[PDB]
A paper describes a structure:
MmpL3 consists of 12 transmembrane helices (TMs 1 to 12) and 2 periplasmic subdomains (PDs 1 and 2).
We then determined the cryo-EM structure of MmpL3 surrounded by GDN detergent micelles at a nominal resolution of 2.94 Å (MmpL3-GDN). The density modification program allowed us to improve the resolution of the cryo-EM map to 2.40 Å. The structures of MmpL3-GDN and MmpL3-ND largely resemble each other. However, there are conformational differences between the two. Superimposition of these 2 structures gives rise to an RMSD of 1.4 Å (for 710 Cα atoms), suggesting that these conformations are distinct from each other. The calculated volume of the periplasmic central cavity of GDN solubilized MmpL3 using CASTp 3.0 is 1,716 Å3, which is similar, albeit smaller, to that of the protein embedded in nanodiscs. A detailed inspection on these 2 structures suggests that there is a relative rotational motion involved between the periplasmic subdomains PD1 and PD2 of the MmpL3 membrane protein, where PD2 is found to rotate by 6° in relation to PD1 of MmpL3-GDN when compared with the structure of MmpL3-ND.
Residue numbers in the entry: 1 to 350, 382 to 757
């Protein structure tokens, strides 16, 4: 197989170098148009019942724009707010803002337009102290992103009201700073880590071209990845955290892939055959190695397709495109580029034997007492997977930002004087058939059915006042064919129980019950994730194990690899749990202990499983190819793992630098992911490969291979069994 590829690839070097760059610069420049298009809202499971209830309710009554952006006004000099002067000034400023930006807002409404009101809806919104009062601004928008952009437009003067000492609250400021933190963090990463990423791999090489090549190809790969998944975005909206994660994954993985091939080609040109033969056997081995690692990681990541959450789909598409394009980038153009480079690789300039001796003696002292080198780490790793039991999960909120932040502080201050204007109630949608008003008793009978259960919010202290109709906006389409009511579950820890009891309620004659609302919206997501988790885990195990069995003929290695990766996964996620849901360190790292998001764990399990498995197979490719040189396993272990230690450690440190750069973020979730990758890589690099692979490898003796031939022949006739060089 791959001999044909080498024999045809040294033929075309200049042509390939031209065409690949000429066709990928299109995506490189096309990524800006991706930078234009952004979506933010999709986090909930699209196919559940709460989303359908919300959709039909939004159809019947429209959307309520009272909670988009909220400003807290405080008067200078501590003056009675009921005066005329300061109120006149603020109304002047606000109606000037209203007229100046017509399309963004509808206007302003609240207490401050009511001099002497009677109804305790806006007079009671004024604090008894009369030193803070909030007045809301509804925003005209077609959908979510249009509203967010309109609020971004109206930022300057709407924040520059009076002296500028009024604070802004609501969902829109939170979303705006959430999406601004992503850009700030991306700028910080691309300014800080990239120099370190380049110089670390430069020092281990002391070379110009050999150090520049991994970055040169990683940038092209990520540019193509954004181009491809933007082309996808025409058929499916892509979320905005797809911007930093594509960097976070692709940079490291593409640099790793290029680094392996560069190292092999250089170590083979320097010692063995000439340029062409060395590069063709270099592709012979490393091209299939990196291709197998890429197919393993895509097979491990595609199980995320099960979850219907949109941003998960976007992340999966971006990462699979990134890695499968980096694979073909590394195998195709790199071989020809190095072949035409020839002696120019290390000629640019600015230990070998001592380093190989240190590695060999470390391996031998592992062989001194391999079981004593594995039992303590085996015990401590389960000791580290213990703390996952106190795990708790929840949705996104305003506490996902550092407490020192201005918008978070303002939102927290909003509830200091306004107790119950920020409510998240549970909704009961109706299901009417005829389309004209059938009966007026249905609201009463559903009220009684809800009354069959106790433990709910009865602030009015009236048996009937509970469960009132939703405030219907005039712009909505009032179809008398579906009815919505609302009220709030008090303690959101009993939200699951209340939702279960309410969904179990009687659906009346011709009436079908629905349960919407933000608690149900954020609970159906976690329920769907926990229901689709088992098949996700089953495929993540089986597909990866079988696929990595096809790389090399042995069948024992997949078995050991499966539980070597799964236990590392458990250990790193347990360390993350003990660190975050308990906030151990927050005090110093400026975040808050809070439950993690539902989809983040589902993403992280798959991604770290893929990373651990691919790093392990990168290490063990030499381990398995060394034996069929006519040697036994005792020499093969050292032969495989001696020269590999120089390069994988540098690559691991590169990904560690990228993750550490992402650690300095503001959002808690990117901190979660970055620490997860740091801990998983640090474990699998420092301790796992260094005292666990040989520890079980020698203990398994020469039995390590024991490959049945009835499947070994199938392994052979795929053409990819060429693990021996002539």
């Amino acid at each position: 197989m791959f001999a044909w590829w080498g024999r045809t690839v040294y033929q075309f070097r200049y042509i390939v170098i031209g065409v690949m760059v000429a066709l990928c610069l299109g995506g490189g420049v096309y990524g800006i148009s991706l930078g234009n298009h952004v979506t933010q809202s999709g986090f909930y499971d699209e196919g559940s019942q709460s989303v359908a209830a919300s959709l039909i309710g939004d159809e019947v009554y429209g959307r309520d724009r009272t909670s988009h952006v909220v400003a807290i006004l405080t008067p200078p000099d501590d003056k009675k707010v009921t005066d005329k002067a300061w109120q006149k000034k603020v109304t002047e400023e606000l109606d000037q803002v209203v007229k100046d930006h017509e399309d963004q807002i509808v206007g302003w409404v609240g207490w401050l337009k009511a001099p002497d009101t009677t109804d305790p809806t806006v007079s009671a919104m004024k604090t008894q102290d009369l030193r803070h009062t909030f007045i809301s601004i509804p925003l005209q928008g077609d959908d979510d992103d249009e509203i967010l952009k309109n609020y971004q437009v109206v930022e300057p003067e709407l924040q520059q009201v009076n002296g500028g000492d009024i604070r802004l609250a609501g969902l829109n400021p939170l979303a705006s700073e959430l999406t601004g933190t992503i850009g700030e963090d991306q700028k910080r990463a691309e300014v800080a880590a990239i120099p370190l990423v380049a110089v670390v791999l430069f020092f281990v090489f002391g070379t110009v071209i050999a150090a520049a090549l991994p970055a040169i190809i990683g940038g092209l790969a990520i540019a193509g990845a954004l181009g491809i998944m933007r082309l996808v975005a025409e058929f499916t909206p892509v979320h905005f955290f797809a911007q930093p994660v594509v960097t976070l994954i692709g940079l490291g993985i593409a640099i790793d892939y290029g680094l392996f091939i560069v190292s092999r080609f250089r170590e083979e040109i320097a010692e063995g055959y000439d340029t062409e033969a060395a590069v063709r056997r270099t592709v012979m081995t490393s091209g299939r190695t990196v291709v197998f690692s890429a197919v393993i990681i895509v097979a491990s990541s595609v199980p995320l397709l099960l979850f219907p959450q949109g941003f998960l789909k976007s992340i999966t598409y971006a990462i699979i495109a990134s890695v499968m394009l980096a694979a073909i980038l590394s195998i195709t153009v790199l071989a020809a580029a190095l072949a035409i480079l020839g002696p120019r690789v290390d000629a640019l300039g600015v230990r070998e034997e001592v380093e190989r001796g240190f590695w060999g003696r470390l391996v031998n002292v592992v062989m001194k007492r391999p079981i004593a080198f594995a039992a303590p780490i085996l015990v401590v790793m389960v000791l580290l997977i213990i703390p996952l039991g106190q795990l708790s999960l929840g949705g996104i909120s305003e506490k996902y930002l550092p407490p020192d932040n201005a918008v978070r502080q303002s939102q927290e201050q909003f509830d200091k004087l306004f107790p119950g204007f920020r409510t998240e109630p549970l909704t009961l949608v109706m299901k009417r058939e005829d389309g004209e008003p059938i009966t007026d008793a249905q609201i009463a009978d559903m009220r009684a059915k809800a009354l069959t259960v106790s433990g709910f919010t009865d602030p009015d202290n009236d048996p009937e006042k509970m469960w009132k109709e939703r405030p219907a906006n005039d712009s909505g389409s009032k179809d008398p064919s579906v009815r919505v009511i609302q009220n709030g579950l008090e303690n959101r820890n009993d939200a699951a129980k209340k939702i279960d009891e309410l969904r179990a309620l009687q659906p009346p004659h011709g009436i079908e019950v629905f349960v919407g609302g933000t608690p149900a919206l954020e609970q159906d997501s976690i329920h769907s994730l926990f229901d689709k988790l088992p098949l996700m885990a089953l495929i993540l195990i089986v597909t990866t194990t079988v696929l990595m069995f096809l790389a090399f003929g042995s069948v024992v290695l997949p078995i050991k690899a499966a539980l070597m990766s799964a236990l590392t996964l458990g250990s790193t996620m347990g360390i993350l749990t003990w660190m975050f849901v308990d906030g151990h360190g927050s005090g110093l790292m400026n975040y808050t202990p809070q439950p993690l998001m539902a989809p983040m764990i589902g993403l992280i399990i798959a991604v770290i499983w893929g990373l651990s498995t691919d790093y392990e197979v990168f290490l063990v490719s030499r381990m398995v190819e060394a034996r069929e040189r006519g040697m036994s396993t005792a020499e093969a272990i050292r032969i495989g793992t001696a020269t590999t230690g120089r390069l994988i450690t540098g690559a691991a440190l590169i990904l560690a630098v990228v993750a550490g750069a992402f650690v300095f973020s503001d959002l808690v979730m990117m901190k979660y992911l970055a620490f997860g990758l740091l801990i998983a890589l640090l474990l699998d690099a420092t301790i796992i490969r260094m005292f666990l692979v040989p520890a079980v490898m020698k203990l398994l003796g020469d039995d390590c291979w024991w490959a049945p031939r009835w499947m070994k022949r199938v392994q052979e006739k795929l053409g990819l069994g060429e693990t021996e060089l002539p």
